[PDB]
């Protein structure tokens, strides 16, 4: 008896090790998938920072141009009011 | 023959255990990796918003440079017509 029973246990263990390896293999594959997603984080962060700095250079330049545009507009409006009078 | 099997069985038992600890370690890694990956859509939407803010800003700025030039020519042409 003892010999075939041990052999049965061993086969059971050996087959269970296959089922364990199968889950490991699937988990490792998902971890490869995950690592790629996670690797975009610094790129997305660098990309946001870049666009943020360019936005801010443009906003600063555009603010300085409303000031002089309103002044040109006022001088034009005032000059138009004189010509229409005389 | 028989003690060989007994010792093979014991190695298979330790291997079951060492495989399950690998599985458990892989599972808890996936847990902390899920957190990190759930930041991604927000970082994506952030990059998108700055891009849109930058493109609208650039466009508004190029328009304004053209309008400034335009007003300056009108101020000068209205002077010529003045005189």
């Amino acid at each position: 008896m003892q010999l075939e029973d041990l052999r049965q246990q061993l086969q059971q263990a050996e087959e269970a090790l296959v089922a364990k390896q199968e889950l490991i293999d699937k988990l490792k594959e998902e971890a490869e998938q995950h690592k790629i997603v996670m690797e975009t984080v610094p790129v997305l962060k660098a990309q946001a920072d870049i666009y943020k700095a360019d936005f801010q250079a443009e906003r600063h330049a555009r603010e300085k141009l409303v000031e002089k545009k309103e002044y040109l507009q006022e001088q034009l409006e005032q000059l138009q009011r004189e010509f229409n009078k005389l | 023959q028989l003690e060989d099997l007994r010792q093979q069985l014991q190695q298979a038992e330790e291997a079951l255990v060492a495989k399950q600890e690998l599985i458990d370690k892989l599972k808890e890694e996936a847990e902390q990796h899920k957190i990190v990956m759930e930041t991604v859509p927000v970082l994506k939407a952030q990059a998108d918003i700055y891009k849109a803010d930058f493109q609208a800003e650039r466009h508004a700025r190029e328009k304004l440079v053209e309008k400034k030039e335009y007003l300056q020519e009108q101020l000068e042409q209205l002077q010529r017509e003045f005189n």
Binding site: E14, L17, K20, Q21, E22 | -
Partner: peptide, 29 residues
Amino acid sequence: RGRWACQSCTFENEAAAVLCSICERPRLA
């Protein structure tokens, strides 16, 4: 049993081995 060649890394293992000595994969995987 006899020696067995791991089907993943090709290492020739001892008959008694349950996992591959090198890549650690089970004999029947």
